[PDB]
């Protein structure tokens, strides 16, 4: 078994093993996560 | 070149902000775009005007439009005024000294609400960025930020230091604990936005988007984890539009309470809080009526709950104004009458008095006692002009023509007219002629202060343009009926002379200063030049993507400028009609372009609120003038060229006048600070029987622990080798103190194991040689708690792997 994508559409699950529901995240946490994803897709 | 600077600004009575009333009907403080006006209601004259400084057009002046005032709050006792701007800046103003005392910058958007505390030492601000910040006036710092709301802060209530209730555009009502800086309660006030909030003792009223208005009781000391705010009942106001502001006022003599719900429409609805004895009297009566009707007691109880709101509240009276209302405020409460002051979106101040006796008012409608209207115009100015003497400025707007003194800035005369589109003085400065949208031509006399003549059938459509020859005897009028008509002035009345019928609608007509050319702009993106003497077609100018909106001809009749809705200024030569240059001047449609007299330099104004100064020979922009908040509709240049007057959509007439450590070393420093404190406390405690740590607010063990965590693991092993042996004994003492804190031990148990074993391994030889008995006890101790913590984790791991294995066995047995 290996940690993959979040099964629910409202949650972010990282390969680190930490799950993050979008509801609980602050606006500041969501912004940096979005920018982090933007960096990941850019190099991809 | 010379610089143009804003000499004066006038024509605004109340901008898009609230109004603050101060007792002496007393004075009123209203916003005028970037400046604040103080009016005297009785006289209707401007008392003082607050301007920070830095007039637009100066070199030191900023390069963007100034921030407009959005909210005004004045602490009556301390004689301070707080002003919030559209950029999120709060400026505390000394009303007596008329100067800025403090400047706060903590909001990223426009300020929606300001509120002094009762004592006047702390200021609370809410902004469109959804943050509430509490400022310390004495300390000139932001104490803390309240960041739960997800939209603009519409309203909030804080009458005590302990608690704060806040409303936002996301539809939530939130109770704050000012001592913990946290939100305790959250309820959905309305299905959409929530716009109003007023609190009186336990009673609390909020308004949503629709006509529904909710009632809540505020039991602050409930302390159940819920129910500090409980909804009681819903009452529907007459106005279906959103309710913006709610305000309570109490009559000291009779203890009666009144409030209004300022609507987005032209209505203010006032209400009355029934006294308890009235509620008890009514409750008994309505019970009798329902009981007589044969209803059951349970039904009667439910009905009372359904009609609960009606018991406390009584619709008192509704104020109707001719214009949409921007803000309102209670002025005076008395047994005889109740008074309100409001500002409209159409640039005026209105004062209303409500005489009443007992439950109901005496008069069917409120009494409009005072109004401030003379120094402004209700609708935006569509055209302006300057008299040949450069003393009178005529500003034509929809429904009124007003005339000003450029020196005193005071309107001299007002004339009622139609939807005026173009105005121009006749020579001598004693007459004005208007072109209305209805096709009417109106002529006015200043000395008579009345209209001389009206031509109802001057044109079949809007008279978009109108111009005069240099002699002043001939008038050229262009209209949307696709005709140019020439008129003569004979002793004064206007006589039709000729008609020139063109192929499309006419937007601008200009006559050359030498009276030789006549330039006409058409809706087909072309400008046609005629010979005025013979009316023979001469040239046609092509090159504009969109229709030409303004035309002007140089003083020597060589160049002609055309500005269009395609954002381009094109300079042409009248000799052959060739385009000398096309300038991408503005970011929106360019409405007016004028030559400076006796020079080829010209001005340009556009819908993007910018007035630009250009060089007609070098084709370069000399100066950008950022003063208007919205579209600039009209522009005018003095005959001398000394000043330029511009009027905008914001009701303002502005006059421009010509003037490091590495890993291991950080650990060594951390050990010195932490263990110096630990040893100091140990020595202090034995006898009884720092700045860095206090700033970070961490116990010495945690301060060292955090330093260990930050060290990257690839650097960690090499960082520990650099440490001397003297710091190793310090390290062992730190591990010993950590062992007492079981919470800290297990949180970072693997890390302490890796570090502790590496230290012992690297310098085992020196450790054993030391004959310190105290060190022996530490290692004996550090061993025991280290084993127990490790074994506890291993015991859980060993237990689970066997249990989970057993679960597999039973599922396999039952399913195979």
């Amino acid at each position: 078994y290996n940690v993959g994508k979040a099964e629910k559409d409202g949650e972010i699950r990282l390969k680190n093993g930490v799950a993050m529901s979008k509801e609980e995240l602050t606006r500041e946490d969501k912004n940096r996560l979005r920018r982090a994803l933007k960096r990941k897709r850019s190099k991809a | 070149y010379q610089r143009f600077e804003q000499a004066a600004a006038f024509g605004v009575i109340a901008s898009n902000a609230n109004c603050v009333w101060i007792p002496a009907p007393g004075q009123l403080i209203t916003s005028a775009l970037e400046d604040v006006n103080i009016w005297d209601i009785k006289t209707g004259d401007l008392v003082s005007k607050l301007s920070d400084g830095l007039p637009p057009g100066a070199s030191d002046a900023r390069g963007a439009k100034p921030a407009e005032c959005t909210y005004l709050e004045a602490h009556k006792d301390t004689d301070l005024l707080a002003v919030g701007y559209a950029d999120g800046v709060i400026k505390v103003w000394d009303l007596m000294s008329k100067t800025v005392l403090l400047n706060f910058n903590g909001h990223k958007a426009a300020i929606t609400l300001l509120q002094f505390d009762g004592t006047g030492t702390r200021l609370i601000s809410g902004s469109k960025d959804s943050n509430i910040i509490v400022w310390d006036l004495v300390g000139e710092v932001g104490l803390y930020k309240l960041r739960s709301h997800k939209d603009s802060i519409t309203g909030f209530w804080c009458q005590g230091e302990d608690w704060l209730i806040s409303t936002s555009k996301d539809g939530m009502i939130k109770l704050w604990d000012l001592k913990t800086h946290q939100c305790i309660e959250t309820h959905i006030a309305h299905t959409g936005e929530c716009w109003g909030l007023a609190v009186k003792d336990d009673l609390l009223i909020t308004t949503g988007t629709d006509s529904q208005v909710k009632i809540w009781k505020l039991d602050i000391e409930n302390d159940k984890m819920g129910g500090k705010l409980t909804e009681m009942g819903i009452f529907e106001k007459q106005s279906k539009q959103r309710g913006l502001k709610i305000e309570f006022i109490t009559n000291s003599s009779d203890k009666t309470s009144f409030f209004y719900i300022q609507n987005a429409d032209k209505t203010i609805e006032t209400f009355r809080i029934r006294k308890e004895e009235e509620i008890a009297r009514g409750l008994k009566k309505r019970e009798k009526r329902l009981k007589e009707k044969g209803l059951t007691e349970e039904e009667i109880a439910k009905s009372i709950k359904e009609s609960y709101s009606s018991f406390i509240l009584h619709p008192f009276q509704t104020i109707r104004s001719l214009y949409k209302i921007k803000s309102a405020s209670w002025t005076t409460v008395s047994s005889s009458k109740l008074e309100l002051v409001l500002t409209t979106s159409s640039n005026t101040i209105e004062y209303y008095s409500i005489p009443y006796e007992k439950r109901d008012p005496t008069s069917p409608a409120p009494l409009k006692t005072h109004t401030i209207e003379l120094q402004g115009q209700r609708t935006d100015v569509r055209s302006i002009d300057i008299s040949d003497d450069n003393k009178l400025l005529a500003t034509a707007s929809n429904g009124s023509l007003k005339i000003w003194n450029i020196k005193t800035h005071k309107c001299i005369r007002t004339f009622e007219c139609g939807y005026a589109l173009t105005c121009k003085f006749l020579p001598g400065g004693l007459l004005v002629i208007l072109g209305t949208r209805n096709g009417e031509l109106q002529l006015f006399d200043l000395a008579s202060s009345s209209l001389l003549d009206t031509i109802e059938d001057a044109h079949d459509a809007a008279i978009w343009s109108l111009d005069l020859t240099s002699d002043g005897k001939r008038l050229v009028t262009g209209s949307a009926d696709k005709t140019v008509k020439f008129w003569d002035f004979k002793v004064l009345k206007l006589h039709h002379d000729t008609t020139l019928e063109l192929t499309d609608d006419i937007l601008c007509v200009r006559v050359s200063p030498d009276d030789r050319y006549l330039a006409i702009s058409l809706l087909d993106n072309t400008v046609k030049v005629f010979f005025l003497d013979s009316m023979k077609f001469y040239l046609s100018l092509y090159g504009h993507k969109l229709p030409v909106l303004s035309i002007d001809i140089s003083f020597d009749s060589k160049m002609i400028i055309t500005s269009s809705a395609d954002k381009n200024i094109k300079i042409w030569g009248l000799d052959f009609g060739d385009c000398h240059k096309s300038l991408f001047a503005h970011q929106d449609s360019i409405m007016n372009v004028k030559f400076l007299p006796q020079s080829h330099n010209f001005f340009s104004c556009s819908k993007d609120a910018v007035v630009k100064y250009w060089d007609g020979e070098k084709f370069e922009c000399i100066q950008k003038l950022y003063a208007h908040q919205s579209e600039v509709w009209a522009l005018a240049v003095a005959t001398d060229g000394g000043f330029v007057v511009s009027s905008s959509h914001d009701h303002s007439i502005r006059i421009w006048e010509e003037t490091s450590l590495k890993a291991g070393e950080r650990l060594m420093e951390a050990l010195d600070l932490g263990i110096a404190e630990i040893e100091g406390l140990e020595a202090y405690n034995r006898d009884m029987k720092n700045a860095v740590l206090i700033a970070v607010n961490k116990t010495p063990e945690q301060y060292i622990m955090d330093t260990l965590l930050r060290i990257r693991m690839s650097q960690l092993e090499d960082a520990l080798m650099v440490m001397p042996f003297s710091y190793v004994l310090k390290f062992l003492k730190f591990i010993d103190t950590v062992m007492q804190n079981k919470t800290l031990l297990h949180s970072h148990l693997p890390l302490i194991c890796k570090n502790l074993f590496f230290i012992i391994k690297f310098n085992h030889k020196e450790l054993v040689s030391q004959k310190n008995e105290e060190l022996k006890l530490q290692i004996n101790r550090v061993k025991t708690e280290l084993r127990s913590a490790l074994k506890s984790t291993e015991d859980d791991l060993g237990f689970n792997v066997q249990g989970l294995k057993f679960v597999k066995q039973q599922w396999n047995l039952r399913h195979n």
Partner: protein, 233 residues
């Protein structure tokens, strides 16, 4: 948008909408202003010749050629209220959850985090609840809270415990929660829960890895014992 001939068409909601029936048996509610199919009602298996509306379409009756009536009742107002009440409840739970964590009421905050499905908050509740116990598994109250969990909550909780276990920095919280579940539930019942076994498939290999580690750390800890005997000499 109709797959077959349209047999009936009537206006509902005054000018706003239009409802139509077709031989395909499908009743489509359209928006007159935008001309888009807002909803499709499929309760018939044959052509619809008759369609009657009452109270501006608040009640609609359609008769199949087979002889089946469908008495449609408008329920937009009813559905929005259910959403509003659901939304109102969710806002209360969020605020109550935050208050419990700040107060440190981990036993109550645990229940809310499970219902709201907030993993980070659930991890913090369990992590810091464990920290206090350091100073049976978690607490007498919180163990009871875990015990009363139903099958759906257990599967969700074990999924989190599975993911936390993979990371060596967070496995400790996972092991104790699993230990609490095994110690406060019928093991027979846990097996029957569908999908529980596949979740338990993933936990065991990582648990063995964590067990091989830590055990080595116990071996390394005996360097201290060798230090003490040398000092005794």
């Amino acid at each position: 948008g109709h797959t077959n001939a349209v047999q009936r068409c009537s206006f509902i909601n005054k000018q706003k909408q239009l409802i139509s029936c077709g031989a395909d048996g499908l009743i489509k509610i359209w928006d007159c202003s935008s001309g888009e199919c807002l909803k499709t009602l499929d309760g018939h298996n044959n052509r619809l010749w008759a369609l009657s509306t009452m109270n501006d379409g608040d009640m609609i009756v359609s008769a199949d050629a087979d002889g089946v009536f469908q008495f449609w009742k408008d329920c937009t107002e009813q559905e929005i209220e259910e959403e509003q009440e659901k939304a109102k409840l969710q806002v209360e739970q969020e605020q109550s959850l935050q208050n419990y964590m700040s107060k440190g009421d981990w036993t109550n905050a645990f229940l809310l985090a499970m219902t709201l499905d907030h993993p980070m908050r659930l991890f913090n509740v369990l992590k810091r609840a464990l920290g206090e116990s350091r100073s049976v598994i978690f607490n007498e109250e919180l163990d009871q809270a875990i015990s009363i969990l139903n099958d759906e909550q257990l599967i969700l909780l074990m999924k989190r415990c599975r993911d936390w276990n993979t990371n060596a920095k967070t496995h400790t919280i996972a092991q104790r929660t699993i230990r609490c579940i095994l110690m406060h539930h019928n093991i027979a019942k846990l097996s029957e829960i569908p999908g529980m076994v596949k979740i338990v498939d993933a936990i065991i290999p990582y648990t063995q890895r964590h067990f091989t580690r830590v055990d080595n750390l116990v071996e390394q800890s005996y360097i201290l014992d060798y230090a003490l005997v040398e000092m005794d000499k």
